[PDB]
Design a protein around this nucleic acid. Structure first.
Lengths: 521, 86, 661
RNA sequence: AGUAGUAACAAGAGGCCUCUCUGCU
């Protein structure tokens, strides 16, 4: 017999094939004979001729006048100032510094050695309440500070915390709802479905600008020291080693790298404690190790933290972290920044001969395993910076025929230091250097880590098309648009209460004003 | 997550699976205050567990084995290294 | 002096610094709760764009079906599913008559690959909806349970080995009057106790044999699991993805193979191209289109996106496509290549988990499942959910699943839709007017170049392309598309400006310990950096920083810092002792406390082979010991093969090749 | 409370009681 394959359909699949034809046919064989036999030529023109003229793109030519500012409700002075909702303090932190020889040690031990040196802040027992949150309990929060500062300073190895009434209040014990069978839920009339709580609508606060100002500058200490690689042999390794040794030499002493390492070490120890001890409340200190320009290692203690009951089965179950952090910033200077915090005044320090007041910011806070797991990997904030740096170098290498890293950084008799536009003092422009631009890029990556949720994702993805349209207007490519109100309304539903998204909208408006003003010249 | 699982395993005291023989009898039960391996029996396979400090104990003070002719086995990467070195 | 980051764009072009508009250092958004609301929304949106079509009732399943093909033309810029049949037939006929011999060659290649492959191809994929237990499973266990339950009803095609008898078993199982299967059930067995009650009601696992009817087997065969899309960057609000069963994978594989064989010989398809070939594809396309412009004429370029793209394509249009393509083919392959559109035109969405109703004063909560969704009055849901349920109600079947005729619902035909887009791009002109269009199409993304005498004729050609794609069910997003002159565009988030190509929207992966063992993770991490540097175009200094970040994470995870460092621990004591005892210290491994030597040129070499001629004889004796008690028994997976979640590393079986409990 | 953002966690399963060591030159 002939050696042909067999695939013969049943009855049910033939009926499902018979009822799967477009409109105008009866069975499958009529449709198959229609496609095989008849000729379709010339039908697209008739179908376009009988279609309505209201189906179109309606294209409009883009001008510099059709670009209104995005998000006009952030200048509205009846909305509240957007609060500070990051996990840890960034530009307001105060590390109690204790000089060591550089040996690593347990966190509990580090805090105990840092508090015995600064023994006037540890022995403070009578508080001075400066600021209180709306729903906080200042007596319970002060008793939790005393319980942490006594449990970190005893003469054992454990940092377990007893479940007292204030630790049960602060860690939120006994607040989940009990599940019931679905028959009792259906038969009961007072069991509705909860309306969702949408995020708020806040206006621009001035503290994000000072966060961007202060985390770009150079400090005196450095907490970043990446490990080694091999020697350099091939010339690609020479070019890469030159760009590395200039980028790291510019990024090392900035405040942002100190804040990045503080976040890395804290989320590491928090994840370790949440997986190791699910049932206990454990004291977790906020610490770091830092080094000045002579090689002297310091241990910085930034605060203490209480971890709740971490029985986190799914990846989005929340554990409660209560944070007590030292600072020197007066919380009554900028009152609209701290409604989430309870501040006490716990003492004084000598920075160089003068007294600085020392405040304690206390806050109930929370996190899930995905944010703690992505917290240990905040050193990716270097990579996205460094990669971006090379995209600014190689475009300069679209001009000449050698590695222009030294030319962009120092130059020679041919080149010059490429001044960048860095910011706006008093209204006029201000030009910085390449290292200052690298630190602004690194702080932008870091604040994408710190202040990043779905609002930042949606806002970035919907304003990138607007940035490409403005690039098209700068080049005089002459862009045409089809529905600009849709692009703008897709942008402006992402600006609710993220501080970085509101400040990005403000900065976008300022830069678009500069670009319009420089178009007329 | 296998990254965090390997992290929390290396935090644990005995995460490894030491096979039997006389070599698992050469490794002690402790060393300078570091308990290298435990000493117990299992339900089905009758085994023990050990630390990674025991692996470094093997690499520091373990017995010398025979490696007269190791380079004849994995010579692909040794040709890679021979191309790299010149 | 107020620092502004956007001022970076005053001295740098925006394409060169576009990677700061990718926030890839923050957390990708996850979805706590149920994806029942998002699935109900996707069902409503699918049935909303096609409600003006023919609505009827299936005489197989009883679900309410909706057919929009050859329906009325649109009258607004709202999305449409009314694809005319003669327009798709004319687009495919022009596509065949411009590339002669293409369709017959693609059909012959697809049949001569069908007559080769075996059922293990149905394991090299993704999760699979399991009809036995009504849940997602891996592909191997889903195929295994389907085979061992087909054996009870005398369906022995899979015992032969091929794919054609297995698909014959699939299309013959739909005619069984009763289907019996192995369902794992923890049916209780009563055990005594010494307590006040004396019984311990426990759940002992076993295997029982249950059976359903023919209609229930059909509705479980046509079913489609739904969930929420986790960790998707670039959108504010979440969305649902689907997942099909195992009764459909063997046909989807052949249809995808046929459309890939068409797309490989298409000169305007940016998929499945990959690497620096993509940057060459953009540059070649712009060069070929600027090599055809009229003198004194303008060449524009539309950078575009597709709105509701996999919700408005129909499976009946795909049935007509595969009936046209496989035309000069034998009858059995013409019936084989027309079964995946049949099973996709009758698909049934499963609605997920349900809705959690709470009582705030008594502090109680419960979860209403999908069958009992309409068992409570509708004024106990919130307004968004209440309008959703009022609009869902005519399509809900009483088993908790909702009918879903139109739409592709996630995209399983990511190549046949690409063929439809290229068929739309190949028309080039309507009514002898003075323009010509061309361009690239990548599944959902597309880029359209238009050459004409001025820019008014360019806009008229763009309008004709929009109105032409309305006739195919290809909806072009008017809010996410813009149009400029040639030399500045974007395709699959590869940006093109003045010949320069900026390749991005690839998040750099977790340069950290994978978790297999020490030598395995070192080899996997260095191969990750080398593959990123070859394919993704990662720079030299970026790759050296990635080496250093991986070395820091590696030394933290396995507690194996350098011997001349001040780090302390239970392992660093013996590590510092080893550093004290060693004469030649550069031969030590990273995990023994030695230094790092990896640079850009030796990422392909194993660590042991890289350092072998530098070790002390004692250290290589203890390291490369023959009877070392840490390895155990050998197998291929413990030597070379492990996944990245696949690669093949080179691990010399020394004492850093242990394994856990 | 808090995290979070269109919907969930703020322990669960059982007979007052049980089960689910952590050092970033």
């Amino acid at each position: 017999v002939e050696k042909g394959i067999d695939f013969k359909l049943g009855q049910t699949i033939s009926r499902l094939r018979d009822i799967s034809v477009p409109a105008g046919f009866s069975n499958f064989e009529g449709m198959r004979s229609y496609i095989d036999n008849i000729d379709p030529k010339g039908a697209i023109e008739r179908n376009l001729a009988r279609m309505s003229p209201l189906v179109s793109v309606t294209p409009k030519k883009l001008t510099w006048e059709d670009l209104r500012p995005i998000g006009p409700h952030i200048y509205n002075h009846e909305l509240p100032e957007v609060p500070y909702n990051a996990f840890l303090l960034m530009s307001d932190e105060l590390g109690l510094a204790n000089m060591t020889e550089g040996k690593s040690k347990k966190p509990k031990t580090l805090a105990k050695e840092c508090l015995e040196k600064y023994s006037t802040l540890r022995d403070q027992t009578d508080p001075i309440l400066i600021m209180k949150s709306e729903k906080a309990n200042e007596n319970f929060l002060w008793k939790l500070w005393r319980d942490c500062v006594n449990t970190i300073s005893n003469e054992e190895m454990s940092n377990e915390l007893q479940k007292t009434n204030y630790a049960k209040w602060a860690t939120g014990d006994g607040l989940t709802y009990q599940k019931i069978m679905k028959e009792v839920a259906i038969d009961d009339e007072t069991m509705c479905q909860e309306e969702p709580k949408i995020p708020n609508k806040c206006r621009v606060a001035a503290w994000v600008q000072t966060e961007m100002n202060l985390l770009s500058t150079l400090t005196s200490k450095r907490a970043l020291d990446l490990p080694e690689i091999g020697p350099d042999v091939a010339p690609v390794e020479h070019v890469g080693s030159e760009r590395r040794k200039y980028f790291v030499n510019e990024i090392n002493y900035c405040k942002a790298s100190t804040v990045m390492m503080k976040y890395v070490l804290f989320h590491t120890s928090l994840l370790n404690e949440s997986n190791a001890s699910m049932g206990k409340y454990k004291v977790i200190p906020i610490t770091n190790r830092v080094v000045n320009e002579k090689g002297e290692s310091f241990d910085m203690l930034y605060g203490l933290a209480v971890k709740g009951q971490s029985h986190l089965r799914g990846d989005t179950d929340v554990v409660t972290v209560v944070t007590f952090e030292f600072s020197s910033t007066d919380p009554r200077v900028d009152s609209g920044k701290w409604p989430k915090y309870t501040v006490f005044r716990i003492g004084s320090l000598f920075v160089s001969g003068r007294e600085k007041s020392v405040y304690l910011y206390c806050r109930v806070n929370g996190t899930n395993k995905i944010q703690m797991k992505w917290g240990m990997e905040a050193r990716r904030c270097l990579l996205q910076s460094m990669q971006q740096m090379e995209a600014i170098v190689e475009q300069e290498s679209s001009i000449q025929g050698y590695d222009m890293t030294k030319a962009c950084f120092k130059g020679d008799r041919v080149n010059s230091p490429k001044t960048f536009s860095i910011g706006t003092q008093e209204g006029k422009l201000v030009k910085g250097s390449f290292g200052k631009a690298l630190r602004v890029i690194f702080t932008k990556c870091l604040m994408h880590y710190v202040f990043g949720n779905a609002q930042l994702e949606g806002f970035s993805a919907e304003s990138r098309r607007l940035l490409l349209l403005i690039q098209a207007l700068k080049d005089r490519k002459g862009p045409w648009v089809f529905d600009l109100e849709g692009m703008y309304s897709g942008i402006e539903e992402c600006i609710s209460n993220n501080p970085w998204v509101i400040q990005s909208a403000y900065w976008f408006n300022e830069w678009l004003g500069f670009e319009k003003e420089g178009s007329k010249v | 997550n296998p990254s965090l699982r390997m992290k929390w395993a290396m935090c644990s005291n005995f995460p490894l699976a030491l096979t039997k023989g006389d070599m698992a009898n050469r490794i002690p039960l402790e060393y300078k205050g570091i308990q290298l391996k435990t000493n117990a029996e299992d339900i089905g396979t009758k085994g023990q567990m050990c630390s990674i400090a025991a692996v470094t104990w093997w690499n520091t003070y373990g017995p010398i084995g025979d490696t007269e002719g190791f380079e004849r086995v994995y010579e692909s990467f040794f040709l890679r290294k021979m191309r790299l070195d010149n | 002096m107020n620092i502004n980051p956007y001022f970076l764009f005053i001295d740098v072009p925006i394409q060169a610094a576009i990677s700061t508009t990718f926030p890839y250092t923050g957390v990708p958004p996850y979805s706590h709760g149920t994806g029942t609301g998002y699935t109900i929304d996707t069902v409503i949106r699918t049935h909303e764009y096609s409600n003006k079509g023919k609505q009827y009732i299936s005489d197989v399943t009883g679900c309410t079906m909706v057919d929009p093909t050859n329906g009325p033309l649109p009258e607004d810029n709202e999305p449409s599913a009314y694809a005319q049949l003669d327009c798709v037939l004319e687009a495919l006929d022009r596509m065949d008559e411009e590339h002669p011999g293409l369709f017959q060659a693609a059909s012959q290649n697809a049949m001569e690959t069908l007559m080769v492959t075996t059922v293990d191809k149905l394991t090299q994929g993704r999760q699979t909806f399991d009809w036995t237990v009504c849940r997602n499973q891996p592909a191997a266990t889903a195929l295994n349970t389907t085979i061992t339950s087909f054996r009870l009803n005398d369906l022995n095609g899979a015992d032969k080995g091929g794919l054609i008898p297995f698909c014959q078993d699939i299309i013959d199982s739909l005619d069984r009057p009763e289907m019996t299967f192995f369902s794992v059930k923890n049916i209780k067995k009563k055990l005594p106790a010494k307590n006040r009650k004396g019984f311990l009601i426990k759940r002992i696992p076993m295997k029982v044999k249950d059976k359903i009817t023919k209609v229930e087997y059909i509705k479980r065969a046509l079913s489609l699991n739904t969930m929420t899309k986790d960790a998707e960057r670039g959108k504010l609000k979440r969305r649902a993805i689907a997942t099909a069963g195992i009764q459909i994978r063997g046909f989807v594989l052949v249809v995808e193979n046929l459309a890939k064989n068409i797309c490989e010989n298409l000169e305007q398809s940016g998929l499945p191209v990959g690497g620096n070939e993509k940057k060459a594809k953009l540059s070649n396309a712009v060069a070929k289109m600027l090599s055809n412009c009229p003198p004194g004429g303008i060449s524009m370029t539309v950078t575009g996106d597709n709105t509701k793209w996999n919700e408005c394509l129909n499976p009946r249009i795909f049935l007509a496509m595969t009936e046209r393509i496989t035309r000069d083919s034998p009858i059995w392959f013409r019936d084989f290549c027309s079964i995946a559109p049949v099973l996709f035109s009758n698909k049934i969405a499963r609605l997920g988990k349900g809705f959690m109703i709470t009582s705030k004063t008594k502090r109680l909560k419960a979860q209403i499942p999908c069958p009992d969704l309409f068992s409570i009055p509708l004024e106990r849901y919130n307004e968004e959910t209440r309008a959703k349920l009022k609009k869902l109600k005519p399509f809900f079947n009483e088993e908790g699943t909702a009918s879903l005729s139109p739409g592709m619902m996630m995209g399983m035909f990511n190549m046949l839709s690409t063929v439809l887009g290229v068929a739309a791009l190949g028309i080039k002109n309507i009514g002898n007017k003075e323009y010509l269009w061309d361009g690239l199409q990548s599944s959902d993304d597309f880029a359209l170049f238009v050459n004409a005498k001025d820019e008014e004729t360019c806009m008229e050609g763009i309008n004709d392309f929009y109105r032409t794609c309305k006739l195919l069910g290809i909806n072009m997003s008017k809010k996410k598309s813009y149009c400029n002159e040639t030399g500045m565009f974007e395709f699959t988030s590869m940006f093109y400006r003045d010949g320069f190509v900026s390749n991005f929207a690839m998040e750099l992966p977790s340069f950290g310990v994978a978790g297999v063992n020490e030598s395995a993770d070192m080899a996997i991490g260095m191969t990750i950096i080398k593959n990123n540097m070859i394919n993704n175009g990662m720079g030299p200094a970026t790759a050296q920083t990635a080496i250093q970040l991986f070395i820091a994470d590696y030394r933290y995870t396995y507690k194996c810092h350098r011997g001349d460092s001040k780090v302390e621990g239970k392992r660093m004591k013996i590590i510092k002792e080893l550093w004290e005892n060693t004469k030649g210290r550069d031969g030590l491994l990273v995990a023994d406390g030695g230094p790092n030597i990896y640079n850009l040129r030796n990422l392909h070499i194993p660590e042991i082979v890289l350092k072998y001629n530098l070790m002390d004889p004692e250290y290589k004796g203890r390291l490369l010991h023959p009877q070392n008690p840490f390895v155990g028994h050998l197998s291929i997976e413990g030597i070379k093969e492990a996944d990245i979640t696949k690669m093949d590393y080179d691990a010399v079986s020394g004492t850093h090749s242990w394994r856990t409990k």
